[PDB]
Amino acid sequence: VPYNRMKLMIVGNTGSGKTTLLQQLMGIDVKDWPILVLNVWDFAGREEFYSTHPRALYLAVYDLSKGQAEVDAMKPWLFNIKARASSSPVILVGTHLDVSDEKQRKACMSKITKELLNKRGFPAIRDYHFVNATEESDALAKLRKTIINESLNFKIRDQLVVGQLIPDCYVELEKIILSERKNVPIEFPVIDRKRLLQLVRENQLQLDENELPHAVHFLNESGVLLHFQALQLSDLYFVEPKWLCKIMAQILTVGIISRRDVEKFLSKKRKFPKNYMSQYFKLLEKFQIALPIGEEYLLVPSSLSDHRPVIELPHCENSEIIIRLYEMPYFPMGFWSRLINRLLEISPYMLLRPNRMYWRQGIYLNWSPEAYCLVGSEVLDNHPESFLKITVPSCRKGCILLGQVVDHIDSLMEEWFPGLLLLKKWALYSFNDGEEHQKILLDDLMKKAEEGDLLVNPDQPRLTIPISQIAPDLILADLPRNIMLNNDELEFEQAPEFLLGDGSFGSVYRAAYEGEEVAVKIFNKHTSLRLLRQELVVLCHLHHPSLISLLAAGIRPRMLVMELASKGSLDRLLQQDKASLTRTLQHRIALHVADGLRYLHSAMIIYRDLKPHNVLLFTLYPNAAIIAKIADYGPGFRAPEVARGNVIYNQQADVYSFGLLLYDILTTGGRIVEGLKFPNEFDELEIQGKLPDPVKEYGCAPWPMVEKLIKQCLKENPQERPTSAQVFDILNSAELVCLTRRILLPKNVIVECMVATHHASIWLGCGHTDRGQLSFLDLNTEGYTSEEVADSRILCLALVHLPVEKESWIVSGTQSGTLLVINTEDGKKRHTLEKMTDSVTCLYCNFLLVGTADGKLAIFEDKTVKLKGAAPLKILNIGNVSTPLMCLSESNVMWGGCGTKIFSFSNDFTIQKLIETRTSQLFSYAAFSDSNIITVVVDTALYIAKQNSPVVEVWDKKTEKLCGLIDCVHFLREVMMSYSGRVKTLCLQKNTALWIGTGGGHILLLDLSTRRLIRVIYNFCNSVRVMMTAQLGSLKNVMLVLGYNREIQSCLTVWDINLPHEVQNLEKHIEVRKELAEKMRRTS
Ligand SMILES: Nc1nc2c(ncn2[C@@H]2O[C@H](COP(=O)(O)OP(=O)(O)O)[C@@H](O)[C@H]2O)c(=O)[nH]1
Ligand SMILES: [Mg+2]
């Protein structure tokens, strides 16, 4: 709809009469003026808004009776206007004509025809008038006509360039919002409830990702409300303009003042939340009201004395100091307060605190007679142009100070006062102490710097000056010793065959430095020096192992010598050698990139470019201290948020980009990268966020943990996405590396036993029901079936393998005592062996050993079990009706548990010793010692776990003695009723790893050679049921951990058998690099 509202900006200096001008025509006094409704902003006082937060017409008002001097005073105002809206209309109005002789009128008339109306650099004043008085006038009638017609003309001009007129149509929903924001009654008008207000007005502009940002954008430009977009009080805090302006302006007027006393006053004036108060102070900085000095003080630039304090500097002879001048036509408004804010952080030691003084128009830092710094404004007669003077003592520390000052000045101007980049840079020098200084432009000194000569007096050759004294910042004399270029080491040709690449900065060649391969950036005639120094500032102070460091810089040919990558960029590797891209290598690359991001984010630097083309590899050797680095720190791969082209980049954009990188790493084919070849789908795909399952879609081997990390990372909402610090923490995990698969079982399925086929599937029992039900899991497809095969509940399964006969059978022992034997190659071949006198408690198989609940051990001949109703070879009575067999271990002598005794068997099935373990109660606790044995692990000692024990007993089988206890509670006691500490199962690996499962979701990794805790693996599931060691169909060895996850959920987790080693190796890796980070940062 045809929006017909436009802003009127009235500017001028204090005492101009501009408010009364407005009155008759009809910090900032804001009121509507229906004529066309104008939103009139009367900048009554020094409202910095015109620089702190700069469809509008400008009315420039000045006092004619003051004259030409006032006209000149308006140049900064005009500059500022042009600097933010050169296309906007400007009407120049002189006032006080009734007390100003026409001499002044025509003097100022000629003044503006000579210096503003026909002068570039000012926003082409559209028209002008002179007014006698605000009583009324024909001049004012004409002015009103001018304002109206010109504002119409302006919007016509916008239609010619922008495409919008004074009835330009804007989405009506935005118009509605304006009205909704008008209707707001809040004591402390700070808005967050806007989300609700959207919901109050039905739900308009529902594209929160696009329409909402546009509405907000409009709301600031249209003069309705205020976002403050890196502040915390920014996005969710929309504030009434009247309060923002009023309160901050008042506090200025309510010069060093302690923060706390300001807080005291403010708390009485307006009871803001202390959180808001911290932001309040931050706003004072950003709006140039007050600058932070120490953490307890504010400078308050405005109102500082403007009578440069008497300062006597040490050093007096011309050769003792260095002087630099900046010639300007006028200082921009706010130039000084911004400059001061930057200069306050200067320090010659950053590579005692200074006695600082403030002039408003200058800063004096003291430190020491050895190194001090004075920056301030000075003006000479017959030279209208104002200008800066910088003075430092001529020595290395003085140089360092100078470098910092001029870098801040140039950066200030590039960001805030472009257009000037005027700024005539002069250096002062003399050929003899006691004489006057001579001026020279730095451009000419640069011409001489290229020659490398002394500055030579053209009239008298005997008089020369070593350039460095005049300009030690043209020659890079302020570099750290560590990066000064040694010209006897650097070896390069600049020949075509060494060209590695180029750009707007010049070109890059391959070279040698101190015997190493390096890359040399050359600033080949591209506004050099300034670009060079900008790069030097960024490169220094960033010293992380994952970044490309600087290996000396040199002004003689203007070079940056940097580290050259040995294996090249990731992108190439992805497309050229998947064999190198092992699972181990991939993980390490992810760590190194994550560190770089964490570091740069803590350094307040947004990378904005994470793609495979930017990742450099320095060795494919998986176990190296440094593998990947991020290039050039300081396309279709964009976050969907920033892809809109209407928001601001931040760490969350980088995080999203990282997630995509990780996705690209996961699928080593670079399948989405191949998608780039069809960019119309590729860029949109990323925008949609609808990425396909990396496993299913590309045929990529499973990698859980990472898979969910990517999903967690790539969220649509920036506030939901993980921080880069968190991303790293997640990547820093042995579990991440070694977890390979996780299969959930169907709801309400309880498996009490497992048999993996050693040849890729698992036979599962089922204790959920009370019926003999046998299930089956296909690891190749994660397929699952199940059928009832027996009456009573299946207790134990065993695999009979007869490779000689080319067949195998599953033996199912159950509660009834029967043995159901089923051919694995033929489900129809089912038969039952001689029924046992009690239930079957365990199976082992060659002989099929059947341990029953009455302590009886049946031994069946290897092949015999094929026949239905077959009887055992022999039967032994070990225990009794109350002492069941529960474990047959063998690692050809058997060992096992019977009640509280440990038995052992020969190859003739004779008892070789009955070790009563009840005597262990002399140690530990009798109710733990006196309990049925659950499992026996046979190594160089026996490891016994008893039912409901928290302690594992270690026995010396050679002497039958207790040789130690393992307290599981203790280990988890060190870890900060899920912590039952009950031991569930014991597995043993011959590399000394001992795997102990427990009641809660924890797995302890112990070191058998020292009996020490390697690591606690936890938050696995609710409870661990069984653990198996099994070789996969790929021949890879893994742990099969079956657990409960009560919602009776249960699941199978597959772990890489080398977990114990990965835990230790990873830990080492992380620590080594940690030390290197400190090494680098400390050198500086
Ligand atoms: N002689 C004369 N004085 C004026 C005229 N316009 C404004 N002034 C005086 O200027 C004062 C208004 O200043 P004001 O606009 O409040 O101050 P400012 O906002 O800082 O410029 C009143 O005293 C006016 O009488 C005029 O046309 N003729
Ligand atoms: Mg006023």
Contact (Cβ atoms closer than 8 angstroms) between residue 649 and residue 642: yes
How far apart are alpha carbons 280 and 276 in whole angstroms?
6
Contact (Cβ atoms closer than 8 angstroms) between residue 88 and residue 60: no
| φ and ψ of 565, to 5 deg | -65, 140
Contact (Cβ atoms closer than 8 angstroms) between residue 181 and residue 219: yes
Look up residue 571 and give its two tokens. Answer: 């992108």
Tell me the structure's resolution in angstroms, rounded to a single decimal: 3.5
The amino acid occupying position 629 is K
Contact (Cβ atoms closer than 8 angstroms) between residue 181 and residue 227: no
How far apart are alpha carbons 570 and 616 in whole angstroms?
6
Q: Which of 917, 1012, 1024, 902 is nearest to 967 (CA)?
A: 1012
Tell whether residue 18 is among the known ligand binding residues: yes
How many Cβ atoms from other residues are within 10 Å of residue 154's Cβ? 22
- Compute, in degrees rounded to 10, the torsion defined by CA atoms 428, 431, 432, 434: -30
DSSP 8-state class, residue 701: P
Residues in the chain: 1084
* Distance spanning both ends of the chain, measured CA to CA: 60
DSSP 8-state class, residue 226: B
Dihedral (CA of 1003, 1005, 1008, 1011) sign: negative
How many Cβ atoms from other residues are within 10 Å of residue 895's Cβ? 22
Q: Residue 6: which H helix or E strand, with range?
A: strand 5-11
How far apart are alpha carbons 209 and 720 in whole angstroms?
14
Dihedral (CA of 507, 508, 511, 516) sign: positive
CB-based contacts of 639, cutoff 8 Å, min separation 6: 652, 653, 656, 657, 718
Q: How far is the CA of 178 from the centre of ligand 2 (A)?
A: 28
Look up residue 617 and give its two tokens. Answer: 């590899």
CB-based contacts of 577, cutoff 8 Å, min separation 6: none
- Which protein residues are within 6 Å of ligand 1, measured from CB? 14-20, 44, 95-96, 98-99, 131-134
How far apart are alpha carbons 365 and 356 in whole angstroms?
5
Which residue's alpha carbon is at the smallest distance from atom 24 of ligand 1? 17
- E strands, 243-398, are 257-258, 297-298, 321-328, 357-358, 362-368, 371-378, 386-393
**Please, which residues bridge with residue 1002 across strands?**
1018
Contact (Cβ atoms closer than 8 angstroms) between residue 770 and residue 788: no
Is 609 assigned a catalytic role? yes
Cα 126–chain centre separation: 48
- 870-883: buried (b, 16+ CB within 10 Å) or exposed (e) per residue? bebeebbebbeeeb
Side-chain-facing half-sphere of 377: CA atoms under 13 Å: 20
Contact (Cβ atoms closer than 8 angstroms) between residue 593 and residue 615: yes
Ligand 1, atom nearest to 132 Cα: 27
Q: How far is the CA of 160 from the centre of ligand 1 (A)?
A: 37
The active-site residue, picked from 158, 168, 609, 838, is 609
Contact (Cβ atoms closer than 8 angstroms) between residue 165 and residue 158: yes
CB-based contacts of 826, cutoff 8 Å, min separation 6: none
CB-based contacts of 978, cutoff 8 Å, min separation 6: 999, 1000, 1001
Task: State the method.
Answer: cryo-EM
Q: How far is the CA of 769 from the centre of ligand 2 (A)?
A: 88
Ligand 1, atom nearest to 99 Cα: 1
Q: How far is the CA of 95 from the centre of ligand 2 (A)?
A: 14
How far apart are alpha carbons 422 and 434 in whole angstroms?
31
| φ and ψ of 485, to 5 deg | -75, 120
Look up residue 584 and give its two tokens. Answer: 């181990």
Dihedral (CA of 238, 241, 245, 250) sign: negative
Which residue's alpha carbon is at the smallest distance from atom 2 of ligand 1? 96
